[PDB]
Amino acid sequence: TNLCPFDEVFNATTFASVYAWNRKRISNCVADYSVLYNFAPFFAFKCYGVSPTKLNDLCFTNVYADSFVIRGNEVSQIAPGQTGNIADYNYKLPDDFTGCVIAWNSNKLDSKVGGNYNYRYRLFRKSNLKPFERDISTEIYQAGNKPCNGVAGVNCYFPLQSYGFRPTYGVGHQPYRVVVLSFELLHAPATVCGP
Amino acid sequence: STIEEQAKTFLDKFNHEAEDLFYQSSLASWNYNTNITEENVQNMNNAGDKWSAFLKEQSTLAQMYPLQEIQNLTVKLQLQALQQNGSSVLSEDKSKRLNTILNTMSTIYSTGKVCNPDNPQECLLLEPGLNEIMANSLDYNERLWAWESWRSEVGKQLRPLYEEYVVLKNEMARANHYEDYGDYWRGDYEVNGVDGYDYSRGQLIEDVEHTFEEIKPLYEHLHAYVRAKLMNAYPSYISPIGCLPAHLLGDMWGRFWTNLYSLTVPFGQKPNIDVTDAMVDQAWDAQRIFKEAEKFFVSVGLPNMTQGFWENSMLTDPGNVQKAVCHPTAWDLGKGDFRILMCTKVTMDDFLTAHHEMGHIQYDMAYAAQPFLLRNGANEGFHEAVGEIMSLSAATPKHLKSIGLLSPDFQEDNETEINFLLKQALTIVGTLPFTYMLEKWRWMVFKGEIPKDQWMKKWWEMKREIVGVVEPVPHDETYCDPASLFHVSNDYSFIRYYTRTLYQFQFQEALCQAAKHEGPLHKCDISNSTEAGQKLFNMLRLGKSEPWTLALENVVGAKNMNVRPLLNYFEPLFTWLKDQNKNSFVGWSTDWSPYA
Ligand SMILES: *[C@@H]1O[C@H](CO[C@@H]2O[C@@H](C)[C@@H](O)[C@@H](O)[C@@H]2O)[C@@H](O[C@@H]2O[C@H](CO)[C@@H](O)[C@H](O)[C@H]2NC(C)=O)[C@H](O)[C@H]1NC(C)=O
Ligand SMILES: *[C@@H]1O[C@H](CO)[C@@H](O[C@@H]2O[C@H](CO)[C@@H](O)[C@H](O)[C@H]2NC(C)=O)[C@H](O)[C@H]1NC(C)=O
Ligand SMILES: *[C@@H]1O[C@H](CO)[C@@H](O)[C@H](O)[C@H]1NC(C)=O
Ligand SMILES: *[C@@H]1O[C@H](CO)[C@@H](O)[C@H](O)[C@H]1NC(C)=O
Ligand SMILES: *[C@@H]1O[C@H](CO)[C@@H](O)[C@H](O)[C@H]1NC(C)=O
Ligand SMILES: *[C@@H]1O[C@H](CO)[C@@H](O)[C@H](O)[C@H]1NC(C)=O
Ligand SMILES: *[C@@H]1O[C@H](CO)[C@@H](O)[C@H](O)[C@H]1NC(C)=O
Ligand SMILES: [Zn+2]
Numbered sequence: 001t002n003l004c005p006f007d008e009v010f011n012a013t014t015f016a017s018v019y020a021w022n023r024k025r026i027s028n029c030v031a032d033y034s035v036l037y038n039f040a041p042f043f044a045f046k047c048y049g050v051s052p053t054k055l056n057d058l059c060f061t062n063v064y065a066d067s068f069v070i071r072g073n074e075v076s077q078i079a080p081g082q083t084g085n086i087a088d089y090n091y092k093l094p095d096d097f098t099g100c101v102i103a104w105n106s107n108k109l110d111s112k113v114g115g116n117y118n119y120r121y122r123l124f125r126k127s128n129l130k131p132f133e134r135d136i137s138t139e140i141y142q143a144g145n146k147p148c149n150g151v152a153g154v155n156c157y158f159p160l161q162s163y164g165f166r167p168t169y170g171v172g173h174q175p176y177r178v179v180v181l182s183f184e185l186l187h188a189p190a191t192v193c194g195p
Numbered sequence: 196s197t198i199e200e201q202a203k204t205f206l207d208k209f210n211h212e213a214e215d216l217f218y219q220s221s222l223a224s225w226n227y228n229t230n231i232t233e234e235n236v237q238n239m240n241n242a243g244d245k246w247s248a249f250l251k252e253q254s255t256l257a258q259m260y261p262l263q264e265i266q267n268l269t270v271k272l273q274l275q276a277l278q279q280n281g282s283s284v285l286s287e288d289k290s291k292r293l294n295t296i297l298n299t300m301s302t303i304y305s306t307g308k309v310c311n312p313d314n315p316q317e318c319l320l321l322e323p324g325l326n327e328i329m330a331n332s333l334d335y336n337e338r339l340w341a342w343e344s345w346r347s348e349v350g351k352q353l354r355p356l357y358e359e360y361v362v363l364k365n366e367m368a369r370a371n372h373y374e375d376y377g378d379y380w381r382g383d384y385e386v387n388g389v390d391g392y393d394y395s396r397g398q399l400i401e402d403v404e405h406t407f408e409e410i411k412p413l414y415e416h417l418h419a420y421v422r423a424k425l426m427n428a429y430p431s432y433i434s435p436i437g438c439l440p441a442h443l444l445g446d447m448w449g450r451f452w453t454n455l456y457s458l459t460v461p462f463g464q465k466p467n468i469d470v471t472d473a474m475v476d477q478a479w480d481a482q483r484i485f486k487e488a489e490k491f492f493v494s495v496g497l498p499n500m501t502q503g504f505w506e507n508s509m510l511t512d513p514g515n516v517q518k519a520v521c522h523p524t525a526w527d528l529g530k531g532d533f534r535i536l537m538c539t540k541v542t543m544d545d546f547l548t549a550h551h552e553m554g555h556i557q558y559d560m561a562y563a564a565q566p567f568l569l570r571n572g573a574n575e576g577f578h579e580a581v582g583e584i585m586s587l588s589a590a591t592p593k594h595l596k597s598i599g600l601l602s603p604d605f606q607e608d609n610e611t612e613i614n615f616l617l618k619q620a621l622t623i624v625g626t627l628p629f630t631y632m633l634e635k636w637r638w639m640v641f642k643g644e645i646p647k648d649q650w651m652k653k654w655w656e657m658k659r660e661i662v663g664v665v666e667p668v669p670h671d672e673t674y675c676d677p678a679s680l681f682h683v684s685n686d687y688s689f690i691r692y693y694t695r696t697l698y699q700f701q702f703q704e705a706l707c708q709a710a711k712h713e714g715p716l717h718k719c720d721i722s723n724s725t726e727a728g729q730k731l732f733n734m735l736r737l738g739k740s741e742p743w744t745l746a747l748e749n750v751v752g753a754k755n756m757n758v759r760p761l762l763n764y765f766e767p768l769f770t771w772l773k774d775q776n777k778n779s780f781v782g783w784s785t786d787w788s789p790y791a
Contacts, residue, residue: 072531115215115219123207123208123211124204124207143196143200143201143204143205144196144201145196154256154259155201157204157208161211164215164218166218166222166530168222168503168507168528168532169530169531169532170501170503170530170531170532170533171501171502171503171531172531173530173531174531
């Protein structure tokens, strides 16, 4: 039996940034839900449309796992119907989103003395994004009524900004590794489910 | 693309960079204050230089969004803070001269060294030395020698620099669209734009004088009592109807009358409440003190403190291996970081200082959600007010009885209440006239109502008339007595102490009324009261986002600073003083002088 590899997403050495998050599909395998209940300190295990205990055995078509890390007081925006910097310009979830969100502290792994400036998010955008839409553009955001021609200056700002995580930060500014799951059903026969 | 959106986006960037830069600077300063070394001082200096350069660059770039076309009243204050020119608007030579003058004055004050006229080398500085003489000595001549020497070998060297400093600061203030430096200083209390909560910069003087007028009778009675009890220690140096000499006030400048309790005690045979022995005989440490104060804060509804406080904060002297500055301060590094630096000992004074610093930390945690520029008190007299009101409740006998440091069968007599009230009055009521007089003199000098040749004359006339203190030796136009104080040699304000003293008792009275307390206000404990905690937290969370008038009304229900709650605090002491002063004279005569 080929078990669903729910062991590389939760145990990766490095995680992606908020503005460019990884998405690895899981299919053609029997799913388990015990290798996920470990790592006892879990900041949030909320689910929408499904129950955690009921999630033991259901048949679906494809499972998507998205990997990124934000600060402590931003997990609240990984929920449907939320507005903010991470919801508008980084990751939007639909109002009919079905799945669960898992968040846990990662201060030991993702913090360095002197700062960790390898994790970046988008600050300003000209508009918003539809659900499940990414944008890796690095153009200059124009805050005025003249074009900057691609160089920072007056009314010209660099969009991305580093987090600068440090081990001495508070619980709201500490890094928090977040994994979301989306369950979809198609006309194809259901195969991705365990015994 | 209106100006409002350009200001909004610019403020967002500025905040997101300022958090990181200020965190770096604060961490460097904290490391220096814990580790006194050369590498850490170099790192702190580098971080401070980077922060100052970034602040100057952003302030220069933020001047292009005029205030007249922005209507939100919350981005108004951020842009007002960022657009302050300060010394920047000046020629390079003038700014260099101003900085040189300030550095020279600070160095002269810090490296002040007077020498006794008997042997050339045993000279004493201010701290220690002269302070110990002026605090713990009863000799008339030694105190006079110290008082005159400090103002003759330090103040004489500050007047030529102070004149040029006044001229340059006045020119800068006028160039910054003000009328004088005093108005620039008063600008902190200014409120403009909000209907019904406005406060002109000129209204400050009127309110201060109006409050001092009602202060006057209690201070007169306390002055008479202190003079009556000071004639016993100095039989042939004080007139029964005259003014108090300036070198017998227990302090170098007469700022506080605290050191006079040994001579002006009402009932000497009855000791004050001291729980140091009970603290020692119950195996108490710094951790227990801070846990008890945290429990007291949780008792009123305020939350626990972060897990990071207990690990990253130092509460004891490291030892001889390390060197740290033993000064109790509350640190808000930002980004969820809260630390307290204190060399805690097993003492009641440290027990109350812990409550003070935790009140500071609670205030800092209250407005953590505000933008960076608004993360401060409502005005310059709000943080210390919270500290005092948080420390006042901890010294009540019932609070000490509830936590086990007082015997359950300890009856409180009304004599100890009088002793405690006199102790409080010697340090709270005896400083308001001094602060008011100093600030009024500085304001009038900045305005120009006092010409350069009448500085000392006006200063001593005001001290004789308002405070009730007379110089022991005549002073001509070469001395600069105001410059001898730390807050004048170094550029700092002084009205904040008066304003905070008047706010703290308003806050205490409001909270005690909200706690359904019955009896005198000086016997009030706000423990086990959620209503007082909510009432305080309603104002604590605003920060600078609202005018201080609204913040004050959110707690006390009054639109303006008052003096009635303070007089209610000292009502039993006032009645006792009136009874004891029936055979004496209340008031003073300006004419009498010790050298007359
Ligand atoms: C603050 O209150 C606590 C708890 O007291 C309880 O709650 C009150 C609202 C009131 O209803 C009391 O009657 C309750 O007992 C006090 O802690 C108690 O103190 C008494 C001393 O008489 C002691 O016998 C209890 O064991 C304590 N309970 C504990 C520690 O859980 C505390 O003393 C009060 N603080 C004051 C009055 O300053
Ligand atoms: C701070 O100083 C700068 C100049 O150093 C001021 O900018 C000038 O202000 C005057 C005032 O009318 C204008 O005429 C100029 O056009 C401005 N620019 C320059 C380059 O001179 C600035 O206004 C000052 N800040 C405040 C709040 O007054
Ligand atoms: C996660 O990674 C750590 C680091 O090697 C490892 O010790 C742990 O066993 C891993 N857990 C799982 C469930 O893979
Ligand atoms: C800084 O303090 C720590 C321990 O508190 C230790 O590394 C050392 O005493 C100090 N560092 C240096 C470089 O002196
Ligand atoms: C002021 O700006 C803030 C920040 O966007 C906004 O939330 C608020 O609504 C503005 N004030 C008014 C009255 O719209
Ligand atoms: C504060 O901490 C104590 C002990 O750690 C705990 O009993 C109490 O519930 C905490 N208060 C809150 C509001 O979490
Ligand atoms: C204290 O109470 C006693 C008892 O009535 C009373 O005689 C006395 O006047 C009161 N005041 C003082 C200052 O002792
Ligand atoms: Zn304080």
